[PDB]
Every structure is written in C-alpha cells, then in structure tokens.
Amino acid sequence: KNPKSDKFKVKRFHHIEFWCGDATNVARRFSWGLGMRFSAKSDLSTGNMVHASYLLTSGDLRFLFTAPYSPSLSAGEIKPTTTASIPSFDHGSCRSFFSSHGLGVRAVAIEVEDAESAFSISVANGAIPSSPPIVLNEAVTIAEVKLYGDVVLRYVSYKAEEFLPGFERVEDASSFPLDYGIRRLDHAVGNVPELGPALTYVAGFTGFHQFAEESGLNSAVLASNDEMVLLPINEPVHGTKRKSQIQTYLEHNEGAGLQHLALMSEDIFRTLREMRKRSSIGGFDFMPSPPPTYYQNLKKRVGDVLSDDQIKECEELGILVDRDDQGTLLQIFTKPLGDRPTIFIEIIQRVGCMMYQSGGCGGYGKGNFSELFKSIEEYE
Amino acid sequence: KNPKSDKFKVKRFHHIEFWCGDATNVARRFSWGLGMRFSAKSDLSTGNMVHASYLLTSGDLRFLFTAPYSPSLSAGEIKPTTTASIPSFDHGSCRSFFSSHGLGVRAVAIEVEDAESAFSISVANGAIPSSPPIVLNEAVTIAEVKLYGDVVLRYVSYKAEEFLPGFERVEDASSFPLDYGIRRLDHAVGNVPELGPALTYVAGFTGFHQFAEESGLNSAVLASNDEMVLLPINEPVHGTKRKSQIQTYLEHNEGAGLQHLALMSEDIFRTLREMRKRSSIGGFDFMPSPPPTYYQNLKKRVGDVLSDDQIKECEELGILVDRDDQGTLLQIFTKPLGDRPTIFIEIIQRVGCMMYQSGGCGGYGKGNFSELFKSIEEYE
Ligand SMILES: Cc1cccc(C)c1-n1c(=O)c2cc(C(=O)C3=C(O)CCCC3=O)ccc2n(C)c1=O
Ligand SMILES: Cc1cccc(C)c1-n1c(=O)c2cc(C(=O)C3=C(O)CCCC3=O)ccc2n(C)c1=O
Ligand SMILES: [Co+2]
Ligand SMILES: [Co+2]
Numbered sequence A, B: 001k002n003p004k005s006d007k008f009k010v011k012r013f014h015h016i017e018f019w020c021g022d023a024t025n026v027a028r029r030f031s032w033g034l035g036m037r038f039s040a041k042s043d044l045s046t047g048n049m050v051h052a053s054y055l056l057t058s059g060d061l062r063f064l065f066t067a068p069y070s071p072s073l074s075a076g077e078i079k080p081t082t083t084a085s086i087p088s089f090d091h092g093s094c095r096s097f098f099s100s101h102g103l104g105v106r107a108v109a110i111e112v113e114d115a116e117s118a119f120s121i122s123v124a125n126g127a128i129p130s131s132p133p134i135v136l137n138e139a140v141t142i143a144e145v146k147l148y149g150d151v152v153l154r155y156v157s158y159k160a161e162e163f164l165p166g167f168e169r170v171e172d173a174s175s176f177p178l179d180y181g182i183r184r185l186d187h188a189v190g191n192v193p194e195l196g197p198a199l200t201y202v203a204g205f206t207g208f209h210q211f212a213e214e215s216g217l218n219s220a221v222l223a224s225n226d227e228m229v230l231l232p233i234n235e236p237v238h239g240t241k242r243k244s245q246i247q248t249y250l251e252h253n254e255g256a257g258l259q260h261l262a263l264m265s266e267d268i269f270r271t272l273r274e275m276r277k278r279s280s281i282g283g284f285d286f287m288p289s290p291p292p293t294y295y296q297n298l299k300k301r302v303g304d305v306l307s308d309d310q311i312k313e314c315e316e317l318g319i320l321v322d323r324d325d326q327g328t329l330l331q332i333f334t335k336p337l338g339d340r341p342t343i344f345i346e347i348i349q350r351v352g353c354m355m356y357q358s359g360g361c362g363g364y365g366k367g368n369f370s371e372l373f374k375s376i377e378e379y380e
Helices: A021-033 A091-101 A114-123 A196-206 A247-252 A267-279 A292-298 A298-302 A306-315 A369-377 B021-032 B090-101 B115-124 B195-204 B246-252 B268-277 B290-294 B296-304 B308-317 B368-376
Strands: A011-021 A037-042 A051-058 A061-068 A104-112 A129-135 A142-148 A151-158 A180-189 A217-223 A230-236 A257-265 A320-323 A327-333 A344-353 B010-019 B036-042 B050-060 B061-068 B105-110 B128-138 B140-149 B151-158 B182-191 B217-223 B230-236 B257-265 B321-325 B327-333 B344-352
Touching: A011 A180, A011 A344, A021 A037, A021 A247, A021 B021, A051 B050, A051 B321, A061 A091, A061 A180, A091 A104, A104 A114, A114 A129, A114 A142, A114 A151, A114 A196, A114 A320, A114 B115, A129 A151, A129 A267, A142 A196, A151 B296, A180 A247, A180 A344, A196 B140, A230 A247, A247 A257, A267 A306, A267 A327, A267 A344, A267 B036, A292 A298, A292 A369, A292 B246, A298 A306, A298 A320, A298 B368, A320 A369, B010 B090, B010 B151, B010 B182, B021 B036, B021 B061, B021 B128, B036 B308, B061 B090, B090 B105, B090 B128, B105 B115, B105 B257, B115 B128, B115 B140, B115 B195, B140 B195, B140 B257, B182 B246, B182 B344, B195 B217, B195 B230, B230 B246, B257 B268, B268 B308, B268 B327, B268 B344, B290 B296, B290 B308, B290 B368, B321 B368
Parallel strands: A011 A061, A104 A151, A180 A230, A257 A344, B010 B061, B105 B151, B182 B230, B257 B344
Antiparallel strands: A011 A104, A037 A051, A051 A061, A129 A142, A142 A151, A180 A257, A217 A230, A320 A327, A327 A344, B010 B105, B036 B050, B050 B061, B128 B140, B140 B151, B182 B257, B217 B230, B321 B327, B327 B344
C-alpha cells in the first residue's frame, strides 16, 4: 500500500555531498575507484575563496566533495558579498563536522519542484531548519533541513526544465571519461540510536510513507510518492552475540549519520570486475565474500532468474542475491570508504518489476542476513 | 667548502609524515599517483585507538599518512597507557594543524645514531623542543624539535643495524607491487617569511652547513656532513611584477611550512611516463610544460650530456634540465598535491659527480628560472 502522502512534489535524488578535509584527494580516489568523471568545479580557479568543491558524475549519479579553505581568504566577505557557490556552507560547521565524524555525507540532496515551498512546508511540519531557501543567479533554489545527526536533507529546484551557478565545467584534458557502469543513487541509509523517533520526524515533515517490506538492527524505509527517493533508517539491537554494526557505527561516527549509499549499476558484473581490478591500486575494497555454500544454495533460490554461468560469475565477484515477491536483487558491499568503520557503499542491480522499473524492486537484501548465517555454518 | 660541522651523527632521510583528515583516501591517491606500495599500517586493526597511520614505500622513500580517530575511542588512556604507535601524536595538535594548513607535511624525519643525544644537543643549541625522546619497545627512539612553522624535524634511531614498533606489515593481497621508479627523498624544502632567522635557527641547532650554490624568492640550502640530508629554505621577494609564489604559499598555508618534496627517480623518463598516464585517472597533474624553444635551447646547454632522442623525450614529458659545474639535473614539478596552492612534488634525476653519487649533484634548478623566462619570450 502506497498512500502517496508527499507534502510537496519530489522528483529524484539530485546529488550527495561529502564534507572532506581535502576535497581533491578524496575526489580523485573516488573517481578512480568508482569510475566517475570529473564534471564540474567551484574553487579558487573559479573565484570561490571560501570552499573547494569538485563534482563527479556517473550517469545520473552526482557525488560532490567539499572542503574549506583558510577563513583568512574570505575574511572580508559577508553573506551578501560571499564568493561561496554553496551559500549554506560554513567554515566552522564543516570543520566541526569533519572533526566529529571524519569523512562522510553532509547532504542528501533531492530535486523538488519548488525548494522554497518544500522548505516552508517541511518546517511547518516539524523539520528543523538548517539553511533557508536561497536563489542562485535567479535560476536555482537551494534549502536545507536537518535529516539525522549532522546530515541535512537538501532541496534543489530549477527554473529551467552547469550543476549549480558558479560551478564551471572542468577542462576536457582533466576530464577522463571513466565509466564502470554505475548509473544512479538507489537509496541512502541512515544509522540512528532510536528508529522510532527518527522515522516519526522525517515522515512527519516529508509525508514520505513506509515502503513495503537477530542481525544487530531494526530498520524501516521511507519513500516518496513514486518510491524513487528511498531513505532507509537503521537502529541497533543491543545485547546480541556479535556486537551490532549499527552501534559500532554510532560509536566511531560520534552519533547518527549516513551509513551507506546504494549505487545502481546497469551491469553489476562489469562494475564489480572493474572495481575489484582497482581495489589494491587506489580503489575500494569489498567485504569478504560468502562461502561457496552460499552460491551452491543460489540454484534453489534464484535458478529461475540467473543461469548457472550468471550464478558462477556472482561467485567469483562475491555478489549477493536476494529476492522478494516482486523482483530479484544483486548486491555487494564495500569496506568502509575511509579511516573509520562508518560509511560504506553498496553496488546493486535490480531485475523485475517492469511497468520503466518500479522503485525498490527486489527489496534491500534483508534475506541475506539469514542466508549468510546459514551458509556460514553450512561451509563450516 | 664543507666544514662538516654536524653537531650529531646524521645518516639519511628516514620518512616524511603527512597529517591528514582521512589518511586512507590520501594514502590510496598517493599510492596510485606515485607508484608506491602499501608497506605497513598502525590503526584500529592493530590495536591503535588514537590515530590511523599508513606507510607507503618506493625504494628507500617512505611516506606516512596519519589522521586522528575520535578522541572518545581513547578517552580512558593516559600517555603511560597509550595505544598510539607514534607517542608524539596529539589529537588537538593534528586537528589544529590540518585546520590551519590543510593537507601537508608535519614531520621531516631523519635517521641518526642516537635520537636522545640528537635531541639533547639540538635543544642545548637552540632547538625548540616538540616531543621528548621516547623509546619504543626498547628498540627505536624518536624525538622531535620544531623546524619551521608547524613542521617538526623528527629524529629516529635504531638499536639494530617493521618501520616502527606497533606497525604491522599489511597483507599481500592489499599490497600491490606498484613501482614507477622513485627511489629516495633527495631534498625537502621549506617556505618561511624571513630566510635569515630561519637559517640561523636550524643551522644553529644542527650544525648543518650551507651547501655550495627576480623570480620571487631568495633561497639557501642547509646540508649534513655528507650532504645527503638537504634542507633548502625559501623566503619571498616582495614588490615584483608577478606575485611571489612563496608569498602565495604563506598566505594559503597560514604561514611557514614545507613547500616541496624532491623525489629521486632511477629513470625519470619512465617515472614521468607512468605518472602522466595517471594524471587524469586519480594521480597527479604536472605544471604546464615549457615552450618548444626551451627544448631547442637544450642542445647548446646539455648536448654533451643528453642525446637528441633523450632531449626529444624530455620535450614530450615536459622535463626541465639544469646544469652546474659538477653535474646535470633533470627535474619536473607537480601541481599542488591538494586543495590549496601550497605543497607540491618535484621529480628529479641527477647525472654526474661519481665517486656512489655525491649529494646535490647538479644543483636545484635555479638556472631554470632564467631559461624559462628566456624561452617564454623567445617562443612568443
Ligand atoms: C556489509 C556489512 C558489513 C558488516 C556487517 C554487516 C551486517 C553488513 N551487512 C550489511 O550492512 C547489509 C546491509 C543491507 C542493506 O542494504 C539494508 C538496507 O539498504 C535498508 C534495510 C536494512 C538493510 O539491511 C543488506 C544486507 C547487509 N548484509 C547482508 C550485511 O552483511
Ligand atoms: C613549480 C613552480 C610553480 C609555480 C611557480 C614557480 C616559480 C615554480 N618553480 C619552482 O618552484 C621551482 C623550484 C625549484 C627548486 O626546486 C628549488 C629548490 O629545490 C631549492 C632552491 C630554491 C629552488 O628554486 C627550481 C625551479 C623551479 N622552477 C623553475 C619553477 O618554475
Ligand atoms: Co542497502
Ligand atoms: Co627542488
């Protein structure tokens, strides 16, 4: 059941912004590791004396990396005269965020019809304001409300139907056309100490509905009207055999924040071949693969969806498979993206639910908790 | 003339430590960009609850990348019970350094016969102490004094004749044997507001001597007895046509600090081929190449050292050539390593001065200031 109760018109995920100590090194590492092209910049070379921001793209996926310059460079500016291209940016906020949490996601940005209306309606319905609507070059409006922890939900609306005003398209020489098949953000997942209050807050100001659904967590998924914006949230379950990875997250992150980004691939086998080639030469590492029994047991579970060759290729790449009543999910998880055992990435591809493909087809892999534990003891 | 006035026995450069916001992403970027292998680690997986430190090596070159964890992880520790593998590390110091300067070099480490003696003699001769000698596992002694700005000169001495106690050798699977030919640190260069006082201070506590020698700078080089540890220092020259790059450094760095690391290659043509292949896929960019007139004029200057083919290969890779009375220098400079126009890297190879090769053979490229300006107007 989908009551379609969005309190304002939401379109799709627009971008994810990481707050960094050095945006250049994180952006270059991510570009190589994920196969994303350098698409736009806002920095000293574009007149921005406040922050360095670099945009990577792969298909419709947009990753922004931002770091502060010395405040001395902009000490004469005031907000009316700022050279920042993202007017919500604040040196103190960014340094405090990075000191507290390490490298991680500051903003989950969604495109809406009217960011000023979305902001007003959100705050009227309980959202804690973070940055009020600001119109950039009479062309784009951006506004921010608190989502959880120090993560904001950023509203972006466009008059037209680039990236942001003040960003420039990087030079072709500096823009190598990397592409490992990643195409869009499927979902963005938060970790909180208490699920109930978090859900009530976010669903309260968005009108997002709950998407139709002992391993250390309880979870729920909030979804927009067409279920294309998907925001799962996890809480820990205490007193378990193995320590909850949600609680480890909260400890090392200094509280709530974004846990993982799930990136849809048009060909998860190519994406994983390309990412695994680069794991030890600057890219990303993946979690340890499941035992071979897990892949033996895939025949009974998804033998009607994947061939034996396609199953065998899942086995060499360490890909996980889950299935609901509507579709099938291929997924795999990276090791944490930086120093702390906090944020990681999920690569996914969904099969089924053809109408375009409806959102969340195949679920989120919750069935892989039981299948992994089963396969663990089976191969033992 | 070399008075050989070292006040304690100095051997060679040992390592360079970068202070980072996220050590993982900087280390992975540098590994791919420079062709250095992951060699050792000290982090949560080795019991270090204080800092994450990753060591990259290429030949004898050692780059260490360190970032702080949340202080909450080690809140119960005191210095006698610390899990830090580098006992000089301090969360506040590291966050303050990175907030002030951005990504950059905290420590220039040299190996000495006795780090405790070097520390005592240095401080007796004017060195400002930074971290007193500490013996690690009865095997290694480390001590630190201020060099310039917030950069320290780190003394390391070994009883035996790994890396540091508490570091572990990374797994083979995570240790890809990258190698683009870089073999050791040739020199490490500081930028200061006033050269005179800086030289007097450092030469005062080390006994290092001045090495035998309008473009925006004055410089001088301090050298150990065998001239294998080389520490040039630059000051700006104000009121020039083009703004001094030393003054730009000081402004964006918030004062004095390390300007560049010069890395000796055993084959600069292979190193630059490999680095330039990777510039736009996560590696390092190089400064704009000199005009073709510069390479036309190489025939008259170094036609007795480099063939026409070897000169032509300098031209395609953008390599610079200078010559003193003793040897010839091939060199090239990267663009800044991170967000700020501060630290960069020089790749060099020296030809001549065979005895082993004596230190500083061919100089530091000061002749390339005049040759570049000459070539600029010539090709105009
Ligand atoms: C990757 C890893 C590292 C260390 C410990 C553990 C438990 C894991 N880990 C996961 O985090 C994980 C996450 C999801 C997942 O994506 C997800 C959602 O997107 C929203 C609903 C809740 C949920 O589970 C699915 C399966 C998972 N599995 C199977 C897994 O093992
Ligand atoms: C790389 C760059 C970017 C923007 C502006 C400029 C001036 C430069 N730049 C250099 O920084 C540069 C540095 C050295 C050098 O290594 C060096 C030493 O190691 C110690 C003695 C002083 C000295 O000059 C030599 C030649 C150089 N040249 C030729 C050059 O153009
Ligand atoms: Co997921
Ligand atoms: Co140099």
